[PDB]
Amino acid sequence: QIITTDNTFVSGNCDVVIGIVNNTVYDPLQPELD
Amino acid sequence: QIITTDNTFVSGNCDVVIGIVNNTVYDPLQPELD
Ligand SMILES: *[C@@H]1O[C@H](CO)[C@@H](O)[C@H](O)[C@H]1NC(C)=O
Ligand SMILES: *[C@@H]1O[C@H](CO)[C@@H](O)[C@H](O)[C@H]1NC(C)=O
Numbered sequence A, B: 001q002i003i004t005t006d007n008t009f010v011s012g013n014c015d016v017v018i019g020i021v022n023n024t025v026y027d028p029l030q031p032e033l034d
Helices: B029-033
Strands: none
Touching: none
């Protein structure tokens, strides 16, 4: 699946996780631009 | 319940999916953006 807010949830800042990596997390609302 | 994008997930087109029937699916964002 494409990585977005739909299939992921946030928890804390990034320095507390060992082995964390970076990648885009698209928000479907942005293209809508309602 | 009324079929909406929140309670339904999607995977693939409805050609090879056996028995699929076409029905309206309403996105809650569109009425709010009207
Ligand atoms: C993710 O990006 C932040 C900010 O650009 C950076 O500080 C961090 O090192 C990056 N993490 C990885 C795993 O590349
Ligand atoms: C449902 O059953 C009928 C009667 O056995 C059959 O003609 C039809 O093809 C079946 N539909 C599916 C999608 O299997």
